[PDB]
Amino acid sequence: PPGPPGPPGPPGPKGDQGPPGPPGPPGPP
Amino acid sequence: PPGPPGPPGPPGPKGDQGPPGPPGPPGPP
Amino acid sequence: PPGPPGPPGPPGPKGDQGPPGPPGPPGPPG
């Protein structure tokens, strides 16, 4: 008969870089 | 005969942290 | 008698998008 299923595949690739952070604080007075 | 392929693998690693945000607004006059 | 196990499965999905970056630098002098 057919053999059992193989194991799970390898992990996928790394995700996309995250979004830019928020704007910085106001500058000096 | 050989069995079927295994299931798809797990999701890949999370993406890198995003870059720094844009510069902040000008300081007060 | 039983056949051999199948091959490994396909690669998984791409990972999640990363977290937001840090705040930007201070703005220009006023």
Structure tokens at B1: 């005969």
Other C-beta atoms lying within 10 Å of the C-beta of residue B15? 19
Spatial separation of the C-alpha atoms in residues A17 and C16, rounded to whole Å: 9
Closest-approach residue (CA) in chain C for B24? C27
Spatial separation of the C-alpha atoms in residues A23 and C22, rounded to whole Å: 9
Chain C residues with beta carbon closer than 8 angstroms to that of A11: 11-12
- Model resolution, angstroms: 1.5
Method used to solve the structure:
X-ray
Spatial separation of the C-alpha atoms in residues A1 and A4, rounded to whole Å: 9
Residue B12 to residues A15, B22, C3, C7: CA-CA distances in angstroms?
7, 29, 31, 20
Cα of B26 to nearest chain C Cα, Å = 5
In the block, tokens 């050989």 appear at B2
**Helix, strand, coil shares of chain C as percentages rounded to 5?**
0, 0, 100
Spatial separation of the C-alpha atoms in residues B17 and B9, rounded to whole Å: 24
Chain A residues with beta carbon closer than 8 angstroms to that of B22: 20, 23-24
Other C-beta atoms lying within 10 Å of the C-beta of residue C3? 12
